[PDB]
RNA sequence: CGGAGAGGUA
DNA sequence: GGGCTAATGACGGCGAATACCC
DNA sequence: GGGTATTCGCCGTGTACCTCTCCTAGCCC
């Protein structure tokens, strides 16, 4: 059939079987591995496997010609088609029923599950050990009973005209033969309905799924037992044997030939009629060696030596490694490619790649010899390979008109993200290396170092059609990772560039008008005018208006020669706003940028390669070199230098002195050196900036210095500040051994000379990072693979769903510092409602449009705190996601269409930047940087005397909500915040709203009265000391830890009353009076102390900063993306209501809480470990932090709600990679965590089990049924469930794509049980069963397919 | 010659089942079955066909009758 | 030549 | 000969198998 | 009580190549 998806597996049943095969193998012959003769009649057969050799006679001793494809016995043979040798397979009719191992090996034993037996009774019957009854005697005998030999004989004698019992498979044959399932599913959905026990009816439920599970199969029970046993061709098993001593494994083929030997044995026996003792050891042994032929894992697996490999079985040879041998590793080499070293060449227009002369002759030799022979130039393959080999001028011809437009696609070595891979049309070159677009190799990562480049030819039409409109660097310039041009030049033409744009003070030709760019160029070219002047240029740009119509607008520009020179480069309907000022790499990002977006591609890439043209040639006539009076040494560095070892031997004299401790003058000489390093660089780079100074008409003048190494870094060229700074000042303080910083920074640059000591110390760094960079490559090599096995079967397509559903989506911001713009974010995005204005209902944008630049700036103009936006989480697609879910961020800048398995792209977006992963305030005061209306969201707190607005606990937010319509800074109120501010109060920058002690955190009384020690035992649960200065107590509250039995079963706790004695509670609040003592809690007030409100209650100390609950690094990334439990889960409120304590630290702690609608006992497990903070009678709601610290992304999906775990692991990871400055657009991390999730665990069942794993879309599905009809079923309510990236991989709904990467024998045995007719969504599956992708082109081509099917 | 695809991207938005169609384009003028409806440049057939899906000339709808036209010949 | 063990490069 | 022939100077995960405080 | 918290064996291995070796083994005729 054509080639399609959706593929079907299912137990065989033998008619079919026999329907496969024609004939069967007489007598089993097999080559000695000495000899390779392949002997007829037996493995190698050519009558039935096909012929083993095409077009010949071939029985071991026959070669006769006669039978050279045609259909004729003469001593056995049939030759034919090497088709028919494909399809032409063998089978053998087993006398006797024979068992599948895999099914009884299986830990869910297929026939002991379907039996309801444990899996002892069937492999004692099936070893031919013990006797079972095959619905025997009943009257006084049990119907289905394993027997020993005598039980066996006493029944026999008992009955033996109404008792059967038999030994092997033929046993459970006869059992699975009487069944009638429908019959036991019936009996038991009939009976579920009178059963009232719960128990008897999980029982009843589970037999009835299984037999359902049968029928939905169509796999009647009898087939499973192996009647008929279907044998491969030989050639479609591994063999290769080695001459001499040495040889290869081959186990199945001997395998083969001794269940042949057993069957023909046990065919005799019978024909013979021999006795039942002799046939039942021959069917045991027949039987084992049909089970060692199934498996020898589940016979027992070993390690042989020299190969890393166990021994060959028709089991082990399903699955090696990496998988499916011809899908993946190893090892796939494929032919018409090359690989070769890479050189530049700075002549190639962008979609071109310089190819030498001889790669080409051999790439195309077979394309070379058809247009050779079309020709009439030669007559046969011989006289093309002559005329090819002897070089003659005219195969020149012959391949300028194959390579005429015949693209080819060059590839890196390390493919990380989607670029790796690019066509190019290639250039017939001279040289032996490959001349690779010099703009296109920042885009592959590469370099220029011996490293070599990879060719492929793309060799029939539709695969070359592939190339150009798909994989050539001209559609491929944005990257597929955040958008955004990848094709920017990078340090040689940005280089040119930011030379020929600067401008001077005083050169020759200042001051003149030139008739536009015309005369820029004739008088530059001239040498008559410098390259640098102030001039005034009458210059026509052209502006896009309209309907998209072209004005040109003539003005006079006060510009440079060099720029108006520049300005001839960029086409129409561009502003001049581009091409003044310095050229930097991010200004001339920008250029590129402004042109995609605002003519579109053509204009892009013809700008892109014009602009690499003009900035090579004008770097070259700028001739920017580097020297060494080039860089220059501040004059005063060795001052600053001098004063600081004058300060910091004060420092070490003050330490002799004992007057400054360990850590105390360690710090004083890190932070003096720092400074000095920071006056340093400072002095260098204010040398650099104006380092040349001219006269305009007398005075002197600063301007942008004409110094190579300044353009050499500020271009962005190569370097940075730091770099610049470390060459000429000192590159200083560094690491040491154990990673601690040195206290004697490395004092030297590199233009003057490195002591020794200082050279060695220098050395662990650089060796610490090539370890690092090893390390680190290997790790992101293996996050691809795992992140591309979890995402890969992704494939977007519907175009909408119509889901109004979708996420807040925010402008992240950390304490004053506004971290990134909603701008960024918004771009690229679908709106989930329609936006209005921050002063007027009115409406913005319409129903869920795009938001490209336009909409984007118009919300920008109409400041938003935040968008609800179409999520690919919040998308309700099944097997797909709608595009409007998704957006269209990728290398085009149209909304994304149906295809493009997005969960590659985000996986390799993902792994693109691992390489770049390495490894007054908060808790002091909270100071407001920024004048605007203070807000407060969450609040836990309750006004008290002295306008004390106390907040407690972390669930508090502190948001700036300015005089425009969002908010410019946020931060995190802790506990017992004390605040003289109110809302919506304009703040001075750096401000106190909120003061409390930083190194201690108290807790502020909001109510006064007495002080209660309630829950508590002196001197057992809290420590006796009380020192009075003002009535206070020293009593200090032992540690949360796990402590004594008589400890640990009171907690203590500190109850506040009124001023009336009267026990007083506020709800609402986490706060209700009685402040349960956490760890540590210094008790400052006694028994019947009288406090104000606004006073502590007792201390906890703090460190002020520094706590540890991110590691950061690539390692951060995969433990977020498997989820795992940062430092122990801090539990939120399981539910909203009330609270209590149960039995405590009975193992750990135990917390009730009691809804006052729900089911009140819901207590949970709390380790000693973690910071308490939990009350009792206070009111509390789902999210609501229980325990202090790290949160787990588990009870955040569980509690707070699918999209707020969303935003969570969105943030972390997108703040990972902020802080390696590599921006990803947040789609791929919201593909990856629906791809997460995709798993959900039912709480009130449904059509299916009341917990068990399933597809959340096929939740979606079931309960859109269950409303369809009437009958409820059941049901269902769902919670979905965070799998681990490898646990959600495994839990693919195919099995192909387990087959290929997890243990094999029993997934295939469940989607062989369960006839699991999977989908073949999954992309690497569709690879593996060697079919068209359902992807980009083979995805439009399979919809194409389904569009013609049933339109025949 | 044109070897950039904006127009093509243009004339069928998906531009993607639009490598499917000029693929078959291609195939079967390279093979008899139908000839070029644009003036040849030396060039391969990818980028002909390219440069009639450019033009208009090749559209879904346009290709789909000129195929089963073909057909109700090749039986007839 | 099928897969493991070892040096070197990138 | 030969034709048959049934840990230690790695590292980390991971299920099974124990180890232990209240 | 019960969740850590150990012990008790198996097993996986970025990218590509350059060279090298080493590969089911037992055994009665």
């Known amino acids: ?1352 | 010659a044109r070897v950039t695809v904006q127009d093509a991207v243009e004339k069928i938005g998906n531009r993607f089942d639009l490598v499917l169609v000029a693929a078959r384009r291609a195939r079967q003028m390279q093979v008899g079955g139908k000839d070029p409806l644009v003036p040849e440049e030396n060039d391969k057939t990818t980028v002909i066909a390219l440069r009639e899906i450019e033009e208009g000339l090749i559209n879904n709808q346009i290709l789909d009758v000129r195929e089963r036209q073909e057909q109700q010949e090749q039986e007839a």
Request: charged share 25%; proline share 4%.
């Open chain 1, 1 to 1352: 059939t054509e080639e399609f998806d959706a593929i079907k597996i299912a137990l065989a049943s033998p008619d079919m079987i026999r329907s496969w095969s024609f004939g069967e193998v007489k007598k089993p012959e097999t080559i000695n591995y000495r000899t390779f003769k392949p002997e007829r009649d037996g493995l190698f057969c050519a009558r039935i496997f096909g012929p083993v050799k095409d077009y010949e006679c071939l029985c071991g001793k026959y070669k006769r010609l006669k039978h050279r494809g045609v259909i004729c016995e003469k001593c056995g043979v049939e030759v034919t088609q090497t088709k028919v040798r494909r399809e032409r397979m063998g089978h053998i009719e087993l006398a006797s029923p024979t068992a599948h191992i895999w099914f009884l090996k299986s830990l869910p034993s297929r026939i002991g599950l379907l039996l309801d037996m444990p899996l002892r009774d069937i492999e004692r019957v099936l070893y031919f050990e013990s006797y079972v009854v095959i619905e025997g005697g009943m009257t006084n005998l049990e119907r289905q009973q394993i027997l020993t030999e005598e039980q066996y004989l006493d029944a026999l004698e008992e009955f033996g005209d109404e008792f059967d019992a038999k030994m092997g498979a033929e046993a459970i044959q006869a059992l699975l033969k009487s069944m009638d399932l429908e019959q036991e599913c019936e009996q038991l959905r009939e009976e579920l309905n009178e059963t009232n026990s719960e128990t008897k009816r999980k029982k009843l439920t589970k037999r009835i799924k299984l037999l359902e599970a049968f029928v939905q199969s169509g796999n009647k029970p009898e087939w499973m037992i192996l009647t008929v046993l279907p044998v491969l061709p030989p050639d479609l098993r591994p063999l290769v044997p080695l001459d001499g001593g040495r040889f290869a494994t081959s186990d199945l083929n001997d395998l083969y030939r001794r269940v042949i030997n057993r069957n023909n044995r046990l065919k005799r026996l019978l024909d013979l009629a021999a006795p039942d003792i002799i046939v039942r050891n021959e069917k045991r042994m027949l039987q084992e060696a049909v089970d060692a032929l199934l498996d020898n894992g589940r016979r027992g697996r070993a390690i042989t030596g020299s190969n890393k490999r166990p021994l060959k079985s028709l089991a082990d040879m399903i699955k090696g490694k990496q998988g499916r041998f011809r899908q993946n590793l190893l090892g796939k080499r494929v032919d018409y490619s090359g690989r070769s070293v890479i050189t530049v060449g700075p002549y190639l227009r962008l979609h071109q790649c310089g190819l030498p002369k001889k790669m080409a002759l051999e790439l195309f030799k077979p394309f070379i010899y058809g247009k050779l022979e079309l020709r009439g130039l030669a007559t046969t393959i011989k006289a093309a390979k002559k005329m090819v080999e002897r070089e003659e001028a005219v195969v020149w011809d012959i391949l300028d008109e194959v390579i005429r437009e015949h693209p080819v696609l060059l590839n890196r070595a390390p493919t990380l993200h989607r670029l790796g891979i690019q066509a190019f049309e290639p250039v017939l070159i001279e040289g032996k290396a490959i001349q690779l677009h010099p703009l296109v190799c920042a885009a592959y990562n590469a370099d220029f170092d011996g490293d070599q480049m990879a060719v492929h030819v793309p060799l029939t039409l539709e695969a070359q059609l592939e190339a150009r409109a798909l994989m050539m660097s001209t559609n491929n310039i944005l990257s597929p990772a955040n958008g955004e041009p990848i094709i920017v030049p990078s340090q040689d033409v940005v280089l040119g560039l930011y030379y020929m744009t600067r401008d001077c003070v005083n050169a020759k030709g200042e001051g003149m008008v030139l008739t536009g760019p015309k005369e820029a160029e004739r008088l530059y070219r001239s040498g008559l005018a410098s390259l640098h002047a102030r001039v005034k240029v009458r210059i026509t740009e052209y502006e896009k208006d309209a309907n998209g119509e072209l004005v040109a607008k003539t003005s006079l520009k006060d510009t440079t020669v060099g720029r108006a020179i520049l300005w001839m480069i960029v086409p129409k309907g561009l502003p001049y706003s581009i091409v003044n000022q310095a050229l930097g790499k991010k200004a001339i990002s920008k250029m590129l940028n402004t042109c995609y977006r605002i003519l579109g591609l053509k204009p892009t890439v013809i700008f892109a390669d014009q602009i690499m043209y003009t900035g090579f040639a004008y770097a070259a006539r700028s001739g920017a070199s580097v020297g060494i009076d080039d860089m220059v040494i501040p004059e005063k560095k060795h001052e600053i230098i001098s004063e600081a070892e004058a300060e910091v031997a004060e420092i070490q004299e003050q330490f002799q002195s004992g007057l400054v401790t360990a850590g105390e003058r360690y710090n004083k000489v890190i932070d003096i050196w720092a400074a000095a390093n920071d006056r340093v660089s400072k002095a260098m780079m204010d040398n650099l900036q104006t380092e040349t100074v001219i006269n305009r008409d007398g005075q002197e003048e600063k301007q942008v210095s004409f110094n190579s190494i300044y353009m050499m870094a500020d271009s962005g060229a190569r370097g940075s500040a730091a770099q610049i700074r470390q060459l000429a000042g000192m590159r200083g303080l560094m690491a040491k051994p154990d990673g601690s910083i040195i206290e004697t920074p490395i004092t030297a640059n590199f233009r003057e000379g490195l002591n020794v000591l200082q050279y060695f110390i220098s050395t662990h760094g650089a060796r610490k990072g090539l370890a690092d960079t090893a390390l680190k490559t290997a790790n992101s090599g293996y996050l691809t693979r795992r992140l591309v096995d979890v995402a890969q079967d992704l494939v977007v397509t519907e175009d909408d769903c119509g889901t109004h559903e979708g996420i807040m989506m925010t402008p992240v911001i950390e304490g004053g510092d506004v971290k990134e713009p909603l701008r960024d974010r918004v771009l690229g995005r679908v709106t989930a409602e329609d936006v209005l204005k921050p002063g007027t209902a009115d409406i913005l944008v319409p129903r869920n449009t795009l938001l490209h630049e336009q909409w984007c700036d118009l919300l920008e103009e109409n400041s938003v705190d935040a968008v609800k936006v179409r999520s690919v989480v919040s998308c309700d697609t099944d097997f797909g996601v709608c595009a409007h879910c998704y957006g269209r961020d990728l290398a085009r800048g149209h909304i994304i269409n149906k295809g493009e398995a997005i969960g590659v792209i985000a996986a390799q977006s993902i792994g693109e930047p691992g390489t770049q992963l390495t490894m007054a305030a908060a808790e002091s005061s909270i100071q407001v940087k920024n004048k605007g209306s203070i807000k407060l969201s969450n609040v836990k707190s309750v006004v008290n005397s002295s306008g004390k607005l106390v907040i407690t606990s972390r669930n508090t937010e502190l948001k700036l909500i300015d005089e425009f319509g969002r908010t410019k800074e946020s931060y995190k109120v802790p506990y017992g915040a004390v605040l003289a501010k109110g809302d919506g109060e304009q703040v001075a920058g750096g401000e106190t709203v909120a003061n409390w002690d930083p190194h201690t955190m108290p807790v502020i009384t909001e109510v006064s009265g007495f002080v209660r020690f309630t829950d508590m035992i002196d001197g057992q649960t809290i420590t006796r000391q009380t020192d009075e200065l003002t009535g206070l107590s020293s009593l200090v509250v032992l540690d949360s830890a796990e402590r004594t039995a008589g400890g640990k079963d009171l907690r203590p706790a500190l109850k506040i009353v009124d001023a009336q004695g009267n026990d007083v509670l506020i709800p609402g609040t986490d706060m209700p009076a009685q402040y349960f003592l956490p760890g540590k809690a210094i008790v400052q007030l006694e028994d019947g102390v009288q406090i104000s409100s606004g006073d502590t209650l007792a201390r906890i100390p703090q460190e002020s900063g520094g706590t540890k609950d991110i590691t950061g690094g690539l390692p951060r990334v995969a433990d977020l993306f498997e989820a795992r439990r940062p430092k122990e889960p801090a539990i939120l409120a399981e539910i909203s209501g009330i609270v209590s304590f149960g039995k405590e630290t009975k193992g750990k702690r135990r917390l009730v809480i009691t809804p006052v609608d729900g089911s009140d006992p819901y207590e949970e497990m709390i380790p000693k470990w973690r910071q308490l903070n939990v009350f009792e009678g206070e009111r509390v709601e789902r999210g609501d932090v229980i325990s202090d610290g790290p949160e787990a992304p588990h009870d955040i999906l569980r509690l707070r709600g699918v999209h707020a775990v969303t935003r969570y692991i969105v943030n972390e990871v997108q703040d990972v990679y902020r802080l390696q400055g590599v921006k990803i657009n947040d789609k791929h991390i919201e593909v990856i965590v629906r791809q997460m999730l995709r798993k959900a665990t039912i709480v009130n069942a449904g059509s299916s089990d009341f917990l068990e794993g399933e597809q959340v879309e096929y939740s979606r599905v079931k309960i859109a049924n269950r409303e369809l009809e009437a009958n409820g079923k059941v049901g269902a309510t769902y919670s979905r469930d965070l799998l681990g990236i490898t646990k959600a991989s495994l839990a693919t709904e195919s099995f192909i794509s387990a087959a290929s990467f997890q243990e094999t024998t029993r997934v295939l045995t469940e989607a062989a049980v369960a006839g699991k007719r999977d989908e073949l969504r999954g992309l690497k599956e569709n690879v593996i069963v060697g079919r068209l992708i359902p992807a980009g082109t083979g995805y439009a081509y399979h919809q194409d397919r389904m569009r013609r099917r049933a339109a025949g």
